[model samples]
Target: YSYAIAKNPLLTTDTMVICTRETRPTSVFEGQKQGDTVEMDDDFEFGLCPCDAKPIVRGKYNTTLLNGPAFQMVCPIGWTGTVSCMLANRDTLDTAVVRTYRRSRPFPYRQGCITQKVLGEDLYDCILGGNWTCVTGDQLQYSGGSIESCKWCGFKFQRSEGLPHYPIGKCRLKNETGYRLVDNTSCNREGVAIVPQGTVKCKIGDTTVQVIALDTKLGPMPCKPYEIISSEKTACTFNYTKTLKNKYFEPRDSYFQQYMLKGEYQYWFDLE
Candidate 1:
């Protein structure tokens, strides 16, 4: 015997029906004219049944379908976006003065191969301000003290607000009154731009930062090398092989048909 459920808001005898074995002589039973009552067990296990209330999602960044899971992304002020460019500061100054030419923010944070953190602007202003530390060139050391006499003939010049520098410091060049060789002879030089004649080193004033530009134009707006992994990629390829062909038999497919590889790589293109 079996039971079935009927769907109707109003309950009536028709809502549920019970089936029983025929009273006369059924497949394996014989009974009175009144059929046996069939009762349905309340608790039963049915697996893999789908309900009508299932959820569906879709869109630009479909939460589950596309973007696996949504993760909030943000960048602080002064940054337009990720910067993926060759971040180069001008090395044009005698001591590489940095000017704010673009009226944009300088690279945020201390940067130098070695030594204290300094910015191009601070040095730029120092030289332009006529506050350069003009000391006697120590060239005399090479010439047996005849042409130069001091290790650092330049006087120690400094002006500091000491407020913990940002994009460099507030100190200006100092000690500009002393005599210095006009030529750059302390180290190797391509050629003599200025004669080595002894002369008072004049104040060169801060070279105004004319502009700030990146060597490359790609990636996040305000980014430095250390901020992210070098954006690079590599491509890999592999040959697949198969063994033993079936003639009178089944078609075979090789499991090692192909191989996929990954690499680190990056490059840039111009807008024009």
Candidate 2:
């Protein structure tokens, strides 16, 4: 009689007995019953059978059933259940500034942007503090110069310490003048009464168009064509061209004619 043994945890003796030869000569296996032991020789070499325990990981003690070996622990849980991560400061200010505009934190925080890193660094600690540099179009340049805050030319000025400054930085008309609007309800014209938003004024070539209180907003202001020149967060300056008159208030008359009514127009209003 011949016997074969397969070593599988799921393969059992009860199933083996059902598959064994049914008829062996009674004299050939005299006292052997169904469940007998047979001592095998070591001549046949079986491959290695390895255990999964030795690869244990270190940390706080923990077990998981999702893993095949059940007790397969990798990292220990945080003792306090939370951790604070800090970014190492760059060795140089320039490098730090670049990183501030290029990288971000691992958790909840603002990401890198030139305006924030160079302009608003003082307001938020996540960005680079102190002076910073930025790329305007394609050229590299410094960030601070005239004009206190960081602003992109052609774009609206940034709100400072949180207050509105110039509606436009510099004039852009052909006459090399700049214009601005100021809030003054007291400068309203006669018979026309709507709390004025502000007034418009211009610096035409040599003459300054005295401020005129306007009942409504200035429509279609003028500016000269110029590239957005940059230095640091501050230097970039864009100006408007000179205009003979307030295009919105007196589109046809010279600014001198409009200035004639200095007292006739109110420059302030009582909102309270």
How far is each candidate from the true structure, as Cα RMSD in Å? 41.2, 24.7
Best by TM-score: 2
Cα deviation of 85 in candidate 2 (Å)? Answer: 16
Query: What is each predicted model's overall lDDT from 0 to 1?
Result: 0.20, 0.23
- Model 1 lDDT tens row, 1-272: 53222222111212012211122113222323231221111211111111111122211121111122112111111111111111111332211111111112312211221111123321111211111211111221111122221212122212212111211212222222122222232211122111223221222122111112233344332111222434356443433334333212232223423222223322222221
The per-candidate count of clashes, in order, stands at: 34, 33
TM-score of every candidate relative to the true structure: 0.11, 0.14
- Candidate 1 least-lDDT 10 residues: 44-53
**Model 1 TM-score, 2 decimals:** 0.11
Question: For candidate 2, lDDT tens digit of each residue in 79-187?
Answer: 1111111121133212100000001121122123222221222122112211132111221233323333332222223333221233233222222122222222231
Would you give me the overall lDDT of model 2?
0.23
